[PDB]
Amino acid sequence: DGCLSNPCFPGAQCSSFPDGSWSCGFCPVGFLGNGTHCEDLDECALVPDICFSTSKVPRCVNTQPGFHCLPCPPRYRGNQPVGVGLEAAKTEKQVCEPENPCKDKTHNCHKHAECIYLGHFSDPMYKCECQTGYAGDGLICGEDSDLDGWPNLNLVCATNATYHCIKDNCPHLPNSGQEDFDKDGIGDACDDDDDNDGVTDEKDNCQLLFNPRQADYDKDEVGDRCDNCPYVHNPAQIDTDNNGEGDACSVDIDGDDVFNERDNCPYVYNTDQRDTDGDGVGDHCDNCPLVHNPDQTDVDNDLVGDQCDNNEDIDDDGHQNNQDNCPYISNANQADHDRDGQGDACDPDDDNDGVPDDRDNCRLVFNPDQEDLDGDGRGDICKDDFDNDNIPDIDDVCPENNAISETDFRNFQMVPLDPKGTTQIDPNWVIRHQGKELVQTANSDPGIAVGFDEFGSVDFSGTFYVNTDRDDDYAGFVFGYQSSSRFYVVMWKQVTQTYWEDQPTRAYGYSGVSLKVVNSTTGTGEHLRNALWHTGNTPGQVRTLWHDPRNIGWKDYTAYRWHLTHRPKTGYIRVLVHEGKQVMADSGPIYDQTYAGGRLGLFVFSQEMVYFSDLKYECRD
């Protein structure tokens, strides 16, 4: 009777008595107390912890009837708890898993592509790369028979892609820059006459310029219309400031307005001419800027002149104690993104925004308020470009380092490993593909061309191809390069040969890929020379860490691909070498903590016509 007037509340059970009175029992699932005046419950705010709190405080959503778990935020995947009431709230809990299209096989990569996980917080998280022996954009992969990253045919990405889609213009000769001067679809590298003027390039004194008459005023054998110094002998055509007028006929070769002979750094632009120590070598080119040293002698090839050079480097990252922004913790790259003098490695706040490294959703970009308005766990201020060097993550070979984004050996140090007086045959390095391909031309002394970028953890690969039948000697590459007495080297001999100098020690150089760590008590010279050639250990010189026991030599005119994995933090090293698509050498895991990082470089020891093509390095920290 009494319940007929609905004095209670929608859903709430009204109990009616014989005398007309009533009482209100339940409040319907998900509501407050008092059966008469009833209100909505917050299952979220003050009960359990139903939803997946992505390093934050939000996430669970309270509705007027019931409650709501947000869908798993980007980079994650799970279920989405929906509940009517309160006993449904302690039971049922949101599990969100960290996504990984590589391990989850949800990727869109080609059968002959590898899905590569870029790391949880990367933009994007994964990419597609064609496997060795193939080329493309990762979605489509075709045969790449010389491993120079350009496929043998035009592929169905030849319209939508920048690189690796379009007929390799020298199908059988590594030429990762695909330079084709006359544009006749035959690349410079295999083209017989590069400028289509009828003079074959071996005879042509202006190889990349049309000049059929061959006019050569001075007999420097570099013809008129390409000679940067037409009236002055200069076969190297060196042009320091790449202005079109070569050094030979320039009174100011670096274009800095201070004339040569006045210039205290004749090769390096320095209008300001500052010379702190007064030694006549300006700071910009002074390898010992604080200490008098006009001769600039640098006997161990680390860019620190003999006079500053004390080798005291207690953490083995190759920067000495007095020149190390983290003297005690290895950090070969010396990264210091906030520029406060404390290296990323020892500094607990790398951008100086108050939010410490471990708790910062944009570790390298200033953002105290940690705005992440799409919920992807990354501050929106570093959305595609973690290190803020304006190169997006996907195109950045070192996405957590603003000093490096491109594989580039365009500028390199020549490190001569056995300098002398006449037998001095220097390596000749020619650079193509904007620093991503080097060809060594000469049957030369041991020598390295080492790039200037520095690495802790690193992956480094490159195409190895010897474009001649002559000789059977060494080529390869270095990593963790610190000084000419401190590097790891991978080198590769064709035929086993004992070195033609029995002094100072007999060196027997076996065929096969050799992984070695140089730790020389003498530095450059005959002792290290021989030790480098020798397969095995040489006390006070070289220690061989691995060498292919099958002893397989490289073949003439044959494309190989090496892949170095180096993780100095543990000491992990892995060297893979590929012939075409098939692995042909694998060191397996190696462990060596002699050097906790350093630079990369290419290596020759008495082998000419060596192509180091389609070079790539990446930071893997």
Ligand X SMILES: *[C@@H]1O[C@H](CO)[C@@H](O)[C@H](O)[C@H]1NC(C)=O
Ligand Y SMILES: *[C@@H]1O[C@H](CO)[C@@H](O[C@@H]2O[C@H](CO)[C@@H](O[C@@H]3O[C@H](CO)[C@@H](O)[C@H](O)[C@@H]3O)[C@H](O)[C@H]2NC(C)=O)[C@H](O)[C@H]1NC(C)=O
Ligand Z SMILES: *[C@@H]1O[C@H](CO)[C@@H](O[C@@H]2O[C@H](CO)[C@@H](O)[C@H](O)[C@H]2NC(C)=O)[C@H](O)[C@H]1NC(C)=O
Residue numbers at the binding site for ligand Z (CB under 6 A): 316, 519, 521, 540, 594
Secondary structure class of 248 (helix, strand, coil) = helix
Alpha-carbon distance of 388 to 299, in angstroms, equals 37
Closer to ligand X by CB, 18 or 421: give it: 18
Q: Which of residues 453-512 bind Ca ion (CB under 5 A)?
A: 471-473, 483
Give the shortest CB-128-to-ligand Y separation in angstroms: 10
CA angle 333, 435, 251 (to 5 degrees): 95
Which of 20, 539 has the CB closer to ligand X? Answer: 20
CA–CA dist 402, 334 (Å, integer): 12
How far apart, in Å, are the Cα atoms of 118 and each of 76, 113, 517, 521, 616? 15, 15, 30, 41, 16
The entry of Ca ion, ligand Y, ligand X, none near residue 157 (CB within 5 to 8 angstroms by kind) is ligand Y
Partner whose footprint covers residue 378, from ligand Y, ligand X, Ca ion, none (CB < 5 to 8 Å by kind): Ca ion
Main-chain dihedrals φ then ψ at residue 551, nearest 5 degrees: 70, 35
Residue-level length of the chain: 621
Q: Tell me, what amino acid is at 395?
A: D
Per CB under 6 A, the segment of 2-10, 212-220, 263-271, 276-284 that binds ligand X is: 2-10
Q: Hey, is 510 helix, strand or coil? A: coil
Which of Ca ion, ligand X, ligand Y, none does residue 22 bind to, with CB < 5 to 8 Å depending on kind? Answer: ligand X
Q: How far is CA 472 from CA 339, 479, 515, in A?
A: 48, 23, 18
CB of 184 to Ca ion, least distance (A): 4
Closest to ligand Y by CB, 27 or 157: 157
Site for ligand X in 488-507 (CB under 6 A): none
Nearer to ligand Y, 136 or 230 (CB): 136
Measured from the CB atom, the residue of 31 and 562 that comes closer to ligand X is 31
- Yes or no: say if 361 and 377 are a contact pair by the CB < 8 Å rule: yes
Least separation in angstroms between CB 145 and ligand Y: 22
In the complex, the smallest distance separating the C-beta of residue 164 from ligand Y, rounded to whole angstroms, is 13
* H, E, C per residue of 91-127: CCCCCEEECCCCCCCCCCCCCCEEEEECCCCCCCCEE
Q: Token pair of 559, please?
A: 């494309």
Two tokens, residue 292: 């008098």
137 contacts which partner out of Ca ion, ligand X, ligand Z, none, CB within 5 to 8 A by kind?
Answer: none
599: part of which helix (H) or strand (E)?
Answer: strand 598-605
Q: Compute the least distance from the CB of residue 451 to Ca ion, in Å.
A: 15
Of residues 324 and 376, the one with the C-beta less far from ligand Z: 324
Nearer to ligand Z, 288 or 596 (CB): 596
Q: Is 150 in the site for Ca ion (CB under 5 A)?
A: yes
389 binds, among ligand Z, Ca ion, ligand X, none (CB under 5 to 8 A by kind): Ca ion
Q: Determine the Cα–Cα distance for residues 214 and 221; give it in Å rounded to an integer.
A: 9
Contact between 2 and ligand X per CB under 6 A: yes
Question: Least CB distance from residue 371 to ligand Z, whole Å?
Answer: 45
User: Long-range contacts for 333-342 (Cβ within 8 Å, ≥24 apart)?
Assistant: 333/401, 333/403, 333/404, 333/454, 333/455, 333/456, 333/597, 334/454, 335/401, 335/403, 337/364, 337/387, 337/402
7 versus 375: smaller Cβ distance to ligand X: 7
- The one of Ca ion, ligand Y, ligand Z, none whose footprint includes residue 540, by CB under 5 to 8 A per kind, is ligand Z
Closer of 137 and 408 to ligand Y (Cβ): 137
* Contact between 60 and Ca ion per CB under 5 A: no
353-372 footprint of Ca ion as x/- string (CB under 5 A): x-x-x--x-x----x----x
Q: Which of residues 510-529 bind Ca ion (CB under 5 A)?
A: none
Contact (CB, 8 A) for 78 and 72:
yes
Enumerate residues 579-608 that contact Ca ion by CB under 5 A. 606
CA distance 589 to 587: 6
**Closer to ligand Z at the Cβ: 312 or 369?**
312
Residue 5 site contact among ligand Z, ligand X, ligand Y, none (CB < 5 to 8 Å, cut-off depends on kind): ligand X
Is position 22 an interface residue for ligand X (rule: CB under 6 A)? yes
Residues 33-62 that bind ligand X (CB under 6 A): 34, 36-37
471 burial type by CB count under 10 A (0-12 exposed, 13-18 middle, 19+ buried)? middle
- Contact residue for Ca ion among 129, 137, 309, 453 (CB under 5 A): 309
The 10 Å Cβ neighbour count of residue 374 is: 11
CB of 36 to ligand X, least distance (A): 5
Cα three-residue angle 202-203-205, rounded to 5 degrees? 105
Return residues touching ligand Y (CB under 6 A). Answer: 139, 156-157, 159-160
By CB under 6 A, residue 17 contacts ligand X: no
In this structure, what token pair is assigned to residue 477? Answer: 């590459």
Amino acid at 112: H
Of 497, 464, 516, the residue nearest 606 (C-alpha): 497
CB of 596 to ligand Z, least distance (A): 9
Of positions 5, 162, 242, 423, contacts ligand X by CB under 6 A: 5
Least distance from C-beta 362 to Ca ion, angstroms?
4
Nearest-CB residue for ligand X: 5
Q: Which residues bind ligand X (CB under 6 A)?
A: 2, 5, 7, 20, 22, 34, 36-37
